[PDB]
Amino acid sequence: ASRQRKLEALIRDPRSPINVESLLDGLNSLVLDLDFPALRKNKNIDNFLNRYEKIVKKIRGLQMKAEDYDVVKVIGRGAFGEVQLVRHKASQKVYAMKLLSKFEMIKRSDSAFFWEERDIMAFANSPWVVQLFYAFQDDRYLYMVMEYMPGGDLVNLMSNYDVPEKWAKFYTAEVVLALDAIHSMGLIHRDVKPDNMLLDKHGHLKLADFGTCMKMDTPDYISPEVLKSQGFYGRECDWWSVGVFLYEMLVGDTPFYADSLVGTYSKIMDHKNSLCFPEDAEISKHAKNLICAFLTDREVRLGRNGVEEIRQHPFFKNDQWHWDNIRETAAPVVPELSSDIDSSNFDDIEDETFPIPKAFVGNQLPFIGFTYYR
Amino acid sequence: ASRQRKLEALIRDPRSPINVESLLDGLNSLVLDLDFPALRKNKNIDNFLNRYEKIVKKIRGLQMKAEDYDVVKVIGRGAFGEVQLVRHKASQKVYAMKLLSKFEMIKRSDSAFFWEERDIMAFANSPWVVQLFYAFQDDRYLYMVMEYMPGGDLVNLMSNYDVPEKWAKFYTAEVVLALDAIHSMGLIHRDVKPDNMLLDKHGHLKLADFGTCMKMDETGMVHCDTVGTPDYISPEVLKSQGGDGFYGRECDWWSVGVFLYEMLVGDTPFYADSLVGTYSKIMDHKNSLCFPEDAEISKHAKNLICAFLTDREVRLGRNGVEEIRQHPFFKNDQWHWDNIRETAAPVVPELSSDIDSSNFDDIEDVETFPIPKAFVGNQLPFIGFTYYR
Ligand SMILES: COc1cccc([C@@H](C)NC(=O)[C@H]2CC[C@H](c3ccncc3)CC2)c1
Ligand SMILES: COc1cccc([C@@H](C)NC(=O)[C@H]2CC[C@H](c3ccncc3)CC2)c1
Numbered sequence: 001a002s003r004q005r006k007l008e009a010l011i012r013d014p015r016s017p018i019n020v021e022s023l024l025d026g027l028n029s030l031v032l033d034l035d036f037p038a039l040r041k042n043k044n045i046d047n048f049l050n051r052y053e054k055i056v057k058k059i060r061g062l063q064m065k066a067e068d069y070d071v072v073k074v075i076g077r078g079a080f081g082e083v084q085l086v087r088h089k090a091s092q093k094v095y096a097m098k099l100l101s102k103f104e105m106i107k108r109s110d111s112a113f114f115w116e117e118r119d120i121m122a123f124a125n126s127p128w129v130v131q132l133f134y135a136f137q138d139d140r141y142l143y144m145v146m147e148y149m150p151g152g153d154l155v156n157l158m159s160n161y162d163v164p165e166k167w168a169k170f171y172t173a174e175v176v177l178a179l180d181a182i183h184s185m186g187l188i189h190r191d192v193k194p195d196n197m198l199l200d201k202h203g204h205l206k207l208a209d210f211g212t213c214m215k216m217d218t219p220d221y222i223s224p225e226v227l228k229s230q231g232f233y234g235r236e237c238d239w240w241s242v243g244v245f246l247y248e249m250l251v252g253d254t255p256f257y258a259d260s261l262v263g264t265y266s267k268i269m270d271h272k273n274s275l276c277f278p279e280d281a282e283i284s285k286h287a288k289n290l291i292c293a294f295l296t297d298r299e300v301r302l303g304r305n306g307v308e309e310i311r312q313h314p315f316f317k318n319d320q321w322h323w324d325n326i327r328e329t330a331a332p333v334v335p336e337l338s339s340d341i342d343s344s345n346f347d348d349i350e351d352e353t354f355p356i357p358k359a360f361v362g363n364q365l366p367f368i369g370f371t372y373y374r
Numbered sequence: 375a376s377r378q379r380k381l382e383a384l385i386r387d388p389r390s391p392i393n394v395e396s397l398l399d400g401l402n403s404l405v406l407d408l409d410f411p412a413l414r415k416n417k418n419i420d421n422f423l424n425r426y427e428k429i430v431k432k433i434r435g436l437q438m439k440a441e442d443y444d445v446v447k448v449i450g451r452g453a454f455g456e457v458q459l460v461r462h463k464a465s466q467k468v469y470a471m472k473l474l475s476k477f478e479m480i481k482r483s484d485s486a487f488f489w490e491e492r493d494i495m496a497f498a499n500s501p502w503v504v505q506l507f508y509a510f511q512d513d514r515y516l517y518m519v520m521e522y523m524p525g526g527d528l529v530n531l532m533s534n535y536d537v538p539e540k541w542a543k544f545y546t547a548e549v550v551l552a553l554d555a556i557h558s559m560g561l562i563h564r565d566v567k568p569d570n571m572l573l574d575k576h577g578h579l580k581l582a583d584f585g586t587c588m589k590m591d592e593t594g595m596v597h598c599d600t601v602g603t604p605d606y607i608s609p610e611v612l613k614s615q616g617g618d619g620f621y622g623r624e625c626d627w628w629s630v631g632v633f634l635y636e637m638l639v640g641d642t643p644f645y646a647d648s649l650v651g652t653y654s655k656i657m658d659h660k661n662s663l664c665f666p667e668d669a670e671i672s673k674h675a676k677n678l679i680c681a682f683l684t685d686r687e688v689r690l691g692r693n694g695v696e697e698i699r700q701h702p703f704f705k706n707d708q709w710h711w712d713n714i715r716e717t718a719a720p721v722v723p724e725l726s727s728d729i730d731s732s733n734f735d736d737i738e739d740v741e742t743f744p745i746p747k748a749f750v751g752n753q754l755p756f757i758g759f760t761y762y763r
């Protein structure tokens with residue numbers, strides 16, 4: 001009764017490794033790993049599969065899958081897959097779907113990063129983090145269905161407008177609160193850049209792409225400790241990147257730009273001397289102060305002693321918004337969109353399986369527990 | 375919504391292969407089959423086990439297990455295990471626990487029979503079938519916790535009393551209704567005998583041991599398997615196992631013929647010193663069936679036995695149970711067919727405690743799977759066995 005009530009609660013919990021969706025993943029994965037003619041020479045395997053042949057087919061039909069979605073356009077490419085703008089066929093609702101190749105993750109020794117990515121987007125319950133509605137999988141891919149962000153990213157905005165300081169104040173303030181939310185969850189991002197800052201239908205920021213997230217105990221935006229470490233470091237390394245972001249928005253170039261990557265690496269390490277505001281750049285004293293406060297050695301960097309000292313910096317003083325209502329004021333640039341599939345703010349994009357194994361190799365074991373239904 | 379409601383129903387259903395207990399069995403079995411040092415040289419396996427190390431330990435603690443029961447006495451022994459009279463420690467309630475060796479089942483190519491046995495005892499919801507409260511498993515055994523029949527079996531009764539025909543009428547009538555219940559569930563028993571007929575606290579029959587149960591076809595027929603203990607097997611069941619013969623519910627009615635003969639006469643109708651002698655007498659039943667001249671038996675009782683102990687084609691119970699029920703032998707002043715189990719039994723057991731096993735005869739180390747070199751899947755056969763009432 002009491003031991004049964006504890007076991008039933010462990011299964012009910014959406015955070016649990018033994019939720020109902022995880023246990024089904026265990027069954028599916030096992031059937032996929034076992035159902036090959038050479039393995040069925042084992043009586044244990046063949047009998048097991050005969051028993052679970054029909055019911056696993058019936059689950060595969062009932063469960064969510066890629067064929068439930070029409071692909072409209074490819075809106076991203078990454079190391080292990082792509083991002084598809086999709087419409088779910090039944091509901092007719094539009095999402096951004098991220099695909100991850102199982103073969104490549106196993107081939108390139110990188111098949112754990114997606115857990116924190118899934119958890120952040122699923123469970124943050126935060127307006128600064130892209131919401132995940134569904135995670136599911138086939139034999140070839142992991143899928144992550146997310147709220148579509150039709151405003152596009154800060155790279156797109158920056159190339160389309162000269163950003164005045166009133167706007168930069170706003171976007172930097174929204175990045176500060178997004179990072180504070182990530183940090184509050186016990187997480188360092190490690191890859192803060194405009195590419196990973198997206199604007200919703202109302203022109204307000206959310207963070208996406210949590211592939212480099214780690215739970216706490218491109219070279220333009222990397223901090224000098226992260227350069228010297230080559231693998232310890234803390235939340236302060238994200239605050240470096242906000243320093244670089246604000247510089248990029250106001251100046252229009254990266255502060256440690258060079259023709260080669262080695263030139264950039266060498267400038268970043270020499271930041272005390274190489275940080276230099278151009279004499280033609282329209283930038284205030286307070287804005288130079290904040291950038292300089294972020295672009296220092298880790299030991300004395302702004303945000304080391306919490307977010308509060310970032311919030312009371314004079315740069316962020318203004319007549320338009322407060323910190324506790326910023327996301328409910330009018331954004332600088334409302335996207336003008338023609339439809340629920342308008343991907344005009346995203347640039348156009350242009351483009352092997354596991355072998356049939358001789359014995360059990362367990363290629364699906366890494367992905368057991370990935371399925372999540374909101 | 376609708377596709378989600380179908381998936382949620384499949385999981386809710388206690389009959390389903392993908393109930394919550396089955397899915398947990400899948401996880402446990404997988405961990406047990408994979409957690410060996412040589413297999414963890416695979417990164418997929420090692421990482422998987424690291425992820426599920428703590429939670430599987432926590433499930434093993436929470437789930438029902440053999441250490442939740444005190445073993446009081448061994449009351450049975452069988453091909454693949456034994457029977458323990460047990461007391462559950464927390465509730466203090468007494469059950470009969472049947473164990474089944476996983477090693478032996480795999481070693482001796484026989485690891486499917488327990489499914490129908492588990493299902494019959496769990497789901498029959500019938501006073502003629504022993505109730506199963508819990509099925510669980512460890513790495514070595516399947517366990518089946520059922521209600522304890524402190525009256526013991528009809529072998530025990532027959533050796534302790536000269537059975538008069540009024541008693542034989544009663545026990546045979548209770549067997550007829552038990553078999554009719556099994557047959558109504560789409561099942562042939564194939565091994566009906568006194569050993570498998572137990573008496574509850576009130577001295578009334580229930581069938582136990584469903585290891586030779588088969589599910590019938592849409593034409594009421596069944597495929598060959600298993601036999602041992604030849605005394606009660608029918609001649610079609612003898613002829614079939616040589617070849618690939620077919621047989622139906624009528625083969626259980628042969629066994630009731632043999633039962634009633636044993637109760638009234640006191641010996642088996644086809645007895646011999648060797649098993650081959652018994653087999654030869656059963657096949658020659660037209661000539662070998664002979665009532666001894668000193669046997670106290672009625673004309674009606676000889677009629678019923680003879681009606682059962684014939685060729686399948688003309689055997690009683692071929693055309694349903696009703697013609698068995700209207701046979702004059704079963705006429706009496708004490709019970710009707712619809713209230714038999716609620717009248718006073720011939721022999722109510724007087725028992726001195728909840729652990730009194732006086733109606734069960736006294737009974738007096740094991741080997742495990744080797745540490746495998748690769749994945750062999752020894753636990754895959756037993757996924758879905760766990761049932762909590
Ligand atoms: C590691 O293998 C990858 C495969 C594909 C993409 C990516 C990485 C670089 N890309 C991403 O994470 C996108 C995902 C879609 C997000 C989005 C949400 C809502 N609207 C528009 C975009 C924006 C980040 C990595
Ligand atoms: C095939 O591997 C076997 C392993 C152990 C036992 C058996 C066979 C011979 N034995 C059985 O089925 C028993 C089970 C307990 C029942 C019971 C119920 C309630 N009270 C007392 C006993 C009586 C039948 C077979």
Ligand SMILES: [Cl-]
Nearest residue numbers: 704705710711
């Ligand atoms: Cl009657």
